[PDB]
Design an enzyme around this catalytic site. Structure first.
Site, mmCIF file in Angstrom:
data_model
loop_
_atom_site.group_PDB
_atom_site.id
_atom_site.type_symbol
_atom_site.label_atom_id
_atom_site.label_comp_id
_atom_site.label_asym_id
_atom_site.label_seq_id
_atom_site.Cartn_x
_atom_site.Cartn_y
_atom_site.Cartn_z
ATOM 1 N N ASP C 25 18.484 34.382 -22.344
ATOM 2 C CA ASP C 25 17.494 33.181 -21.464
ATOM 3 C C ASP C 25 17.083 33.917 -20.384
ATOM 4 O O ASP C 25 17.536 34.146 -19.373
ATOM 5 C CB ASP C 25 18.134 32.155 -21.258
ATOM 6 C CG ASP C 25 17.173 31.066 -20.959
ATOM 7 O OD1 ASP C 25 15.987 31.385 -20.488
ATOM 8 O OD2 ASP C 25 17.408 29.932 -20.512
ATOM 9 N N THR C 26 15.726 34.683 -20.585
ATOM 10 C CA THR C 26 15.212 35.358 -19.561
ATOM 11 C C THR C 26 14.742 34.545 -18.309
ATOM 12 O O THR C 26 14.486 34.683 -17.196
ATOM 13 C CB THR C 26 13.873 36.070 -19.760
ATOM 14 O OG1 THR C 26 13.105 35.153 -20.680
ATOM 15 C CG2 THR C 26 14.456 37.282 -20.754
ATOM 16 N N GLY C 27 14.630 33.065 -18.602
ATOM 17 C CA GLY C 27 14.162 32.038 -17.581
ATOM 18 C C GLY C 27 15.382 31.463 -16.652
ATOM 19 O O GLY C 27 15.019 31.071 -15.692
#
Ligand SMILES: [Mg+2]
Lengths: 99, 8, 99
Positions: C25-27
């Site tokens: 999850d880059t967020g």
């Protein structure tokens, strides 16, 4: 572009001519955007989080421009504190994870 | 801070 | 490897001798994992969600394998509906976003 992940991957998006900041989020199925005025019809929807659900409005076929890429897709509009670009649009711009 | 879990 | 986003970026992780699945999850700033028996010292932490707060256990300087790559960092363990690998560990495996 190639984006390292030492900082939040925040980009400028263009939606209805307006420029907004958004987070490229590989963990999100959907794209979720702060309260704004999009034209036309929407469908009511629910998105789950920790300990409950948030009410949002689902709009289809919305044009969003991201770093020169033009994506058309479904967006969920609601009281999110951060604009989230999800996989539905990330796939349209050719986004991959690499390590 | 995990936006998809609505945690900030 | 190159991970595409046509499906959820779920990968195999190993932590405390146990295999699990987790979302890249880059967020997410941080890494949050399902309840789990983990040895060693931890610090209690609270996080405010939609309906209320959850309590988690913060483990620092933990060794975790992510899709074969060893990484060291902080993991939060508690009642999360999905295992999330955030940027604090994605940087440690040399993960970039590319489009
Ligand atoms: Mg794997």
């Amino acid at each position: 572009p190639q984006i390292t992940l030492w900082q939040r991957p925040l980009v400028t998006i263009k939606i209805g001519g307006q420029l907004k900041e958004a987070l490229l989020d590989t963990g999100a199925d959907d794209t979720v955007l702060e309260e704004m005025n999009l034209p036309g019809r929407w469908k009511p929807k629910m998105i789950g989080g920790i300990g409950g659900f948030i009410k949002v409005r689902q709009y289809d076929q919305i044009l969003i421009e991201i770093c020169g890429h033009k994506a058309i897709g479904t967006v969920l509009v609601g009281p999110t504190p951060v604009n989230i670009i999800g996989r539905n649009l990330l796939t349209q711009i050719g986004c991959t994870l690499n390590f | 801070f995990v936006p998809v879990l609505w945690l900030f």
